[PDB]
């Protein structure tokens, strides 16, 4: 029911990345954000894959392109939403997942930087970091990834996808 866009870091080029961000940007809403909108057109799904054969699905808000949460295998993780409407809305994402978590924090930079123990500007971006970020997000579902590395991997995703589509 939600639009899915694919991207892989395996054999990734400047073109494939640019086309990917173009595809994401082409789904962002431009009409004045109404309230009580159809739930089916509130979110876009970004299915990320890497060399390591791992795969995760990010959930992006159509209004601002920001990550509201993600799916890794049979588990789903959401940032704490800001309001009741957003809270109710995210209960319609990844609804058949058995393991379901809402973090005790929102997905904003100040918080993610505090968690990663570093600032945005110092966090190396690129295809190589996004490779590692995708694994880190995946292996979080199996207890492998620690919270600072997770928080760091979110920043890489948000900057390379959300920020990249936003301008």
């Amino acid at each position: 029911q939600y639009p899915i866009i694919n991207f892989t870091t395996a054999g990734a080029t400047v073109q494939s990345y640019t086309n990917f961000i173009r595809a994401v940007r082409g789904r962002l809403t431009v009409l004045p954000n109404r309230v009580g909108l159809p739930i089916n057109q509130r979110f876009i799904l970004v299915e990320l894959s890497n060399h390591a054969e791992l795969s995760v699905t990010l959930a992006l808000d159509v209004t601002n392109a920001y990550v509201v949460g993600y799916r890794a295998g049979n588990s789903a993780y959401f940032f704490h939403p800001d309001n009741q409407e957003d809270a109710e809305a995210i209960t319609h994402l990844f609804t058949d997942v058995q393991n379901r978590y809402t973090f005790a924090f929102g997905g904003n930079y100040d918080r993610l930087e505090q968690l990663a123990g570093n600032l945005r500007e110092n966090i190396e971006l690129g295809n190589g970091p996004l490779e590692e970020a995708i694994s880190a997000l995946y292996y979080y579902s199996t207890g492998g990834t620690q919270l600072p590395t997770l928080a760091r991997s979110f920043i890489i995703c948000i900057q390379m996808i959300s920020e990249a589509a936003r301008f």
Partner: nanobody, 126 residues
């Protein structure tokens, strides 16, 4: 120091309503995320419902959605579970617990919870 006690359980008929109470002593319950779990005869401990400390996130198991309703009352230091349209499949011992893993506001995994109560028994007959 927190101590959780479940009450409200008993014998009912199918289609009936029932309201459970997770009462706390030792600390304020409004300072926790509170979940209900249950264990039916011959079955594993099952996630049922959770309410976040912030009170805006709730979550339910698929088998209880539309039927069960979680809510909190700090006036009494209690978290409720309204159970409607009860069926024999709901027969179980109902436990409540506090979310003990500070990374999550809500979880369906029992490992993320601590300070489990004794449990209150709910039996739905047909």
């Amino acid at each position: 120091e927190v101590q959780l006690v479940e009450s409200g359980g008993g014998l009912v008929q199918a289609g009936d309503s029932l309201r459970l109470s997770c009462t706390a002593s030792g600390r304020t319950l409004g300072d926790y995320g509170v979940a209900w779990f249950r264990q039916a005869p011959g079955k594993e401990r099952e996630f049922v419902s959770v309410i976040s400390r912030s009170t805006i996130i709730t979550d339910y198991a698929d088998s209880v959605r539309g039927r069960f309703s979680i809510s909190a009352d700090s006036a009494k230091n209690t978290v409720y579970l309204q159970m409607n349209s009860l069926k024999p499949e709901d027969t179980a011992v109902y436990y409540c617990a506090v979310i003990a893993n500070p990374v999550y506001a809500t979880s369906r995994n029992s490992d993320d919870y601590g300070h489990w109560g004794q449990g209150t028994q709910v039996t739905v007959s047909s």
